[PDB]
Amino acid sequence: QVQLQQPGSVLVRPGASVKLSCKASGYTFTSSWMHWAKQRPGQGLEWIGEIHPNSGNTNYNEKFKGKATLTVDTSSSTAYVDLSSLTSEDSAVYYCVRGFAYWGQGTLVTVSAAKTTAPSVYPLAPVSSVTLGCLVKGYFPEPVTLTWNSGSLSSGVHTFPAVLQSDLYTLSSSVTVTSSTWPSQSITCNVAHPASSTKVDKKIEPR
């Protein structure tokens, strides 16, 4: 069945260029037009252009000529878009789409000169139900992944979107469990920041 694998995110310095990838599976790569779309939190989606992997024929949105170049690799069933000389305006999520039907995971493009930085992970223990916490402070760029007990503790979990200041993100996550279950049953937050190759397991311990 159809899947379009796109890298989670990419950090690009202003003025630099970047090549985004879109590996297709579950269907014949050369039997469908591959579309690319740009989405910014600000306003509506934009159609960048399309390419047909079987011929290499392309149709571009006039607005993206000179900014985007679509190519394909039929040997690996992968579609690419080359974005040239990025500005802050180029910061967005870029989707590849099989025809108009199936949307890829989307790649987050962050245009910045800021340095990649691993986060610090701090446990948040209390001063019928008890709430615990996980503080992920000072990382760059997005994103990070956070699970509780390797993912087996999913219910009663709230992971808050990060906040940004001086090129550093800070994120937190809370987990609420029956008070008579902690700390007898240990609770641990699992944090991963791919950019800085950071993997941390923080066990929440009573103060």
């Binding site: 139900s129 709230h158 937190s172």
Partner: protein
């Protein structure tokens, strides 16, 4: 290029209510070759990729619940949800597949209305780990509340502290339709150690008096 005008920008609906969304094209999307309207509707839930709901204006994609209904021909199109479910909160947008460039509508954000829900408040002193490094963050969680409007007040030794406070909101829960917010007072170890009592006060419509959480360093 073809311009897709979508309306309204957002909607707040109670569970079970019928929602209507408009999509108007600057050009007829009716193809004379097969008499089909080249317009599709997509659903994009928070943090997810867009998914196809309806294509050719009124044909539901395989697996899509029948409460999602498409209609209209030529320039004026409509997406209807006969009976909104809590899980349906998301951005809905149209796209024309008639001619390049295949432009999109700016979308409609659908949020859910529901009964009141008082926030569960928890406050967290800085961890030993952080203090070790010279930092000192005080965290306050306000979880599972409705409506969304709320306000957190930080107090240090009984006096309000405003600067250095950053908040973060979760997306509306697709199950209980509540919201959660985190409030973080960021200090340094030295600053933190010059005060005694730290307080997180939550004011919410579910109570005339604030929900107060405190601790003494």
């Amino acid at each position: 290029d073809i311009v897709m005008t979508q309306s309204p920008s957002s909607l707040a609906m109670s569970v079970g209510q019928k929602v209507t969304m408009s999509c108007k094209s600057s050009q007829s999307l009716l193809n004379s070759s097969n008499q089909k309207n080249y317009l599709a509707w997509y659903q994009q839930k928070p943090g997810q990729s867009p998914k196809l709901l309806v294509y050719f204006a009124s044909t539901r994609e395989s697996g899509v619940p029948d409460r999602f209904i498409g209609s209209g021909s030529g320039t004026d199109f409509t997406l209807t949800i006969s009976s909104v479910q809590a899980e349906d909160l998301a951005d809905y947008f149209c796209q024309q597949h008639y001619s390049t460039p295949f432009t999109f509508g700016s979308g409609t954000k659908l949020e859910i209305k529901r009964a009141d829900a008082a926030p569960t408040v928890s406050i967290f002193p800085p961890s030993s780990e952080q203090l070790t490094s010279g930092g000192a963050s005080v965290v306050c969680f306000l979880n599972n509340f409705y409506p969304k409007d709320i306000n957190v007040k930080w107090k240090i030794d009984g006096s309000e502290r405003q600067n250095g406070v950053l908040n973060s909101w979760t997306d509306q829960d697709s199950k209980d339709s509540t919201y959660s917010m985190s409030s973080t007072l960021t200090l340094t170890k030295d600053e933190y150690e010059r005060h005694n009592s730290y307080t997180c006060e939550a004011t919410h419509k579910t109570s005339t008096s604030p929900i107060v959480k405190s601790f003494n360093r």
